[PDB]
Write a protein that binds this ligand. Structure first.
Ligand SMILES: OC[C@H]1O[C@H](OC[C@H]2O[C@@H](O)[C@H](O)[C@@H](O)[C@@H]2O)[C@H](O)[C@@H](O)[C@@H]1O
Ligand SMILES: OC[C@H]1O[C@H](OC[C@H]2O[C@@H](O)[C@H](O)[C@@H](O)[C@@H]2O)[C@H](O)[C@@H](O)[C@@H]1O
Lengths: 142, 142
């Protein structure tokens, strides 16, 4: 499908939820959130992706950890906007759906900012990960 | 049925290319470009819309005119995203296709920017126009 630019840095390892996303529309957003977003894990239909981020509890050597944040999406709800601040890593993520605006994951929003609009709803994400979210790319439905 | 938010201001007159777009897939982008974009005019198959912007030469009282740019799309090329900078008016537009990033229409600016994904490729545009492009909305094929 159509996809955004890659937003972030060259670290970590690549991930791509294309296949897992064939299980269904995004139904849930799970993230780990402190002054930065340290992982993301979407649910596609009934099937969670892997935890993309916070690879190891010893990641606490290099960033804060944060708290788990869960956003359950209702039937027919889809992500239509992502505001990302990023540099070497993704710093913060603000999602908005066709039904509501979700709180920012990552209280600091000082890095370069980009707003990606996804008419019809986000289908899935790809990017890079390790102890944090090194970068993200947003994929539309066609 | 999939369409972006409207990006721009309340001035000008509404336009909508839904009917003329029945003439075919977009084959050409014509714009007029100075420091800002002053009109847009897509070609649907063989058929142009009316010129959306630079209503008449008196508009030189309020902004520069600019020069005509034409991007010819090859068969099978479709517009997959647009980076739009806007406020009261559309300031600049950078179109991207499945094959290439195209030149921006308009130069650098301080206004708000968004990246619009256009799932399945752009079908047609709507918006508002007068002396320039008051706003744009992207209607996708998905
Ligand atoms: O996902 C971010 C980052 O995770 C891993 O690196 C963790 C830290 O390793 C230290 O050696 C380094 O000084 C820190 O900057 C790193 O955050 C992973 O190896 C790396 O590729 C990822 O970018
Ligand atoms: O599409 C831009 C604009 O075109 C027309 O207005 C031209 C200018 O008129 C002046 O009176 C005004 O002070 C300027 O801001 C305008 O650019 C049109 O009438 C208007 O609706 C459109 O917004």
């Amino acid at each position: 499908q159509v996809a955004s630019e890659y937003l972030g840095g060259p670290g970590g390892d690549a991930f791509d939820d294309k296949a897992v996303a064939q299980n269904g529309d995004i139904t849930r957003i799970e993230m780990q959130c402190t002054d930065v977003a340290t992982y993301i894990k979407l649910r596609y239909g009934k099937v969670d992706s892997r935890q993309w981020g916070w690879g190891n509890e010893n990641c606490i050597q290099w960033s804060k950890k944060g708290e788990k944040v869960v956003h359950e999406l209702s039937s027919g709800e889809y992500i239509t906007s992502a505001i990302v601040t990023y540099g070497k890593y993704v710093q913060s993520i603000t999602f908005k759906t066709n039904k509501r605006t979700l709180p920012r994951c990552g209280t600091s929003a000082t890095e370069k900012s980009v707003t990606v609009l996804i008419p019809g709803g986000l289908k899935y994400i790809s990017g890079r990960w390790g102890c944090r979210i090194d970068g993200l790319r947003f994929h539309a439905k066609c």
